Structure 1
């Protein structure tokens, strides 16, 4: 469907850490499997865990990461 990093309303990211124990709890709650965090160009460091439906938000592009 529509997949992405750990998102945050309206559409930006949530925060990982230099390590494995960054934000595993929230993203595994959202319905994620994988784990690692990579910078989102222009929008900030984010931790991708995969297989996310459209129920929780994702990284969406096109204009800016706005409020």
Structure 2
């Protein structure tokens, strides 16, 4: 696992609803045991996930955003 800004698979950001509310639940259904909002200057607004496995993934740049 890692602790990171969660995107969407792959090379994206998600967008968070300040509060955490929705994105926290999104983090938990993907499989991070805490999540929050955050901002990652680069792309923009993003969400955060603690204890996501590395077979779930995050902000990357190299490509552009996917799904």
When normalised by structure 2's length, the TM-score is 0.69
Three-state SS of the structure 1 residue aligned to 2:39 is strand
Question: Is 2:7–2:47's contact at 8 Å kept on the other side of the alignment?
Answer: no
RMSD between aligned residues: 2.6
Higher helix share: 2
Question: Is 1:3–1:59's contact at 8 Å kept on the other side of the alignment?
Answer: no
Query: What is the rounded CA distance, in whole Å, between the counterparts of 1:2 and 1:20 in structure 2?
Result: 19
Question: Is 1:4–1:50's contact at 8 Å kept on the other side of the alignment?
Answer: yes
Equivalenced residues, count: 67
Q: CA deviation at 1:65?
A: 5.8
Question: Is 2:10–2:59's contact at 8 Å kept on the other side of the alignment?
Answer: no
When normalised by structure 1's length, the TM-score is 0.69
Flag structure 2 segments of 5+ consecutive residues without an equivalent. none
Flag structure 1 segments of 5+ consecutive residues without an equivalent. none
- Structure 1 stretches of 4+ with a deviation exceeding 4 A read 61-67
Q: CA deviation at 1:19?
A: 1.1
Question: Is 1:2–1:58's contact at 8 Å kept on the other side of the alignment?
Answer: no
